[PDB]
């Protein structure tokens, strides 16, 4: 819980601020590289609050829908991965970004990629 | 192998015409639903050429680069999945479509989806 809770940075300048609840909740804010108010979005997810050993990762996921008071990209991204604790902690993820489309264009609705997050700014 | 070789149709009416070679090679032509020469592309891949076991599928994959003598879409799709035989043989796949991009748009280069092929259509 205290491990995941904090501020994380990815490789491309995005930030996300998360509280890990004892119940397995993830709650916070995702900030894209721009870093101003129009760049902040609600995030929510879940994680395994009793992982299996000291050397195994902690599975987690979260979602951001890319709508805030300022902009709407009509899309949502989900990140699925694991938290690796210790003194150089990481969150390694794969993500899916789905956009709203017509059924005709549903083939181009979902992009896939990966993100690594650290607590180092 | 003997089951894989033949003509397959996916859910959109695209056509997959394939030869499964004795030693694991897949070769053939992928034909977009349009149907004309402008719609024909080379495919190559590999499959598990071991004798099929009880009720388990045969792993396979193939690639189409979306360039032929008429058109270039500056992209390639890989399908990964398995062949199942029986009364209704099927090939169930997931695919990745990667487009050539600038490095700034690379995060946006790869779409993901799924196709089911039948020898009926």
């Amino acid at each position: 819980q205290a491990g995941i809770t904090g501020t994380w940075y990815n490789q491309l300048g995005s930030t996300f601020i998360v509280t890990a609840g004892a119940d397995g909740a993830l709650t916070g804010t995702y900030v894209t590289a721009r870093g101003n108010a129009e760049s902040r979005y609600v995030l929510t997810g879940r994680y395994d609050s009793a992982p299996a050993t000291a050397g195994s990762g902690t599975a987690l996921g979260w979602t951001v829908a890319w709508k805030n008071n300022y902009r709407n990209a009509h899309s949502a991204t989900t990140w699925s991965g694991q938290y690796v604790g210790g003194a150089e902690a990481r969150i390694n993820t794969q993500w899916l970004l789905t956009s709203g489309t017509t059924e005709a264009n549903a083939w181009r609705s979902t992009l896939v990629g990966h993100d690594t997050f650290t607590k180092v700014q | 192998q003997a089951g894989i070789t033949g003509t397959w149709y996916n859910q959109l009416g695209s056509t997959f015409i394939v030869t499964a070679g004795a030693d694991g090679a897949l070769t053939g032509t992928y034909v977009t639903a349009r149907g004309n020469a402008e719609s024909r592309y080379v495919l190559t891949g590999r499959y598990d050429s071991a004798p099929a076991t009880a009720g388990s599928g045969t792993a396979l994959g193939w690639t189409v680069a979306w360039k032929n003598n008429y058109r270039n879409a500056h992209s390639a799709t890989t399908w990964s999945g398995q062949y199942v035989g029986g009364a209704e043989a099927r090939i169930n796949t997931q695919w990745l479509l990667t487009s050539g991009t600038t490095e700034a748009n690379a995060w946006r280069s790869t779409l993901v989806g799924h196709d089911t092929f039948t020898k009926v259509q």
């Binding site: 491309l12 995005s14 894209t32 951001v64 890319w66 | -």
Partner: peptide, 4 residues
């Protein structure tokens, strides 16, 4: 897109 804002994600990037």
């Amino acid at each position: 897109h804002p994600q990037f």
